[PDB]
Design a protein around this nucleic acid. Structure first.
Lengths: 107, 142
DNA sequence: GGAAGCCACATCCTCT
DNA sequence: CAGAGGATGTGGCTTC
């Protein structure tokens, strides 16, 4: 059915199998898109928009800045952070989640 | 009536002393108007006199506008990029109230002036569950 | 039964 | 390009 971008990313980030093109940095709810093109490809495939690329997917993320859902991490290419309360929404502390996903600290 | 830059650009208000731009019957909210909304004064109104516009109807006693205030200059108050943020309701339009801040103040109205919508004029068309389960519920919320 | 509304993007653009 | 935001068109869905 209907899916929002932040929710899609959230699906990928909770699937160990996707950690090669998208993953958690290790600092709270921050995450990095190591392969933007791949993420855009799947996003395009999910929404049925063949011509979808990162250039456009990023515009969607920028719409969240004002809505306090996702913020950009300054200076770090392809790095954003969920700024909404994912703990209340999912019931897991950044660590518990990181554990279940076997997250290794990023820097 | 025919003291406007172009044909059918101005219309009369419920008051004999003022005229204002003709507004699109339906427009998209937060979108710049096709023409610059003006309020023309027939009588003598000093340069600098403020003019405001309020939109409203049964749905919205008052609707959020942007740039709804302009200064009168040479009998004309030219709003720069006036916009409508608040919607008017399905199949409904806003009445505009023009207040010209002379002393005493003067009110002019433009009834059923414009309908505002999000699209605007448009071309015809125990127990514990997992993440997948949690995410799915979250994706349906609304 | 649909035209008319809402919503969340999708597309396109601007600059260094 | 990456990346902030404005301007508009697009499609899925819902509501009088």
């Amino acid at each position: 059915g209907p899916i929002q971008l932040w929710q899609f990313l959230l699906e990928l980030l909770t699937d160990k199998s996707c950690q090669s093109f998208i993953s958690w940095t290790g600092d709270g709810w921050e995450f990095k898109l190591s392969d933007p093109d791949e993420v855009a490809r799947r996003w395009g495939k999910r929404k049925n928009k063949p011509k979808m690329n990162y250039e456009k997917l990023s515009r969607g993320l920028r719409y969240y800045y004002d809505k306090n859902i996702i913020h950009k991490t300054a200076g770090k290419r392809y790095v954003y952070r969920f700024v909404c309360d994912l703990q209340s929404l999912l019931g897991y502390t950044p660590e518990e989640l990181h554990a279940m996903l076997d997250v290794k600290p990023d820097a | 009536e025919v003291l406007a830059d172009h044909p059918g650009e101005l219309v009369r208000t419920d008051s004999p002393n003022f005229l204002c731009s003709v507004l699109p019957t339906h427009w998209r909210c937060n979108k710049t108007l096709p023409i610059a909304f003006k309020v023309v004064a027939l009588g003598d109104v000093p340069d600098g006199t403020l003019v405001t516009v309020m939109a409203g109807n049964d749905e919205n006693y008052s609707a959020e506008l942007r740039n709804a205030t302009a200064a009168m200059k040479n009998q004309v108050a030219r709003f720069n990029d006036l916009r409508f943020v608040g919607r008017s309701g399905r199949g409904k339009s806003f009445t505009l109230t023009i207040t010209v801040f002379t002393n005493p103040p003067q009110v002019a109205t433009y009834h059923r002036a414009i309908k505002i919508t999000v699209d605007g004029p448009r071309e015809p068309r125990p127990g514990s569950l997992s993440f997948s389960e949690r995410l799915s519920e979250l994706e349906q919320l609304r």
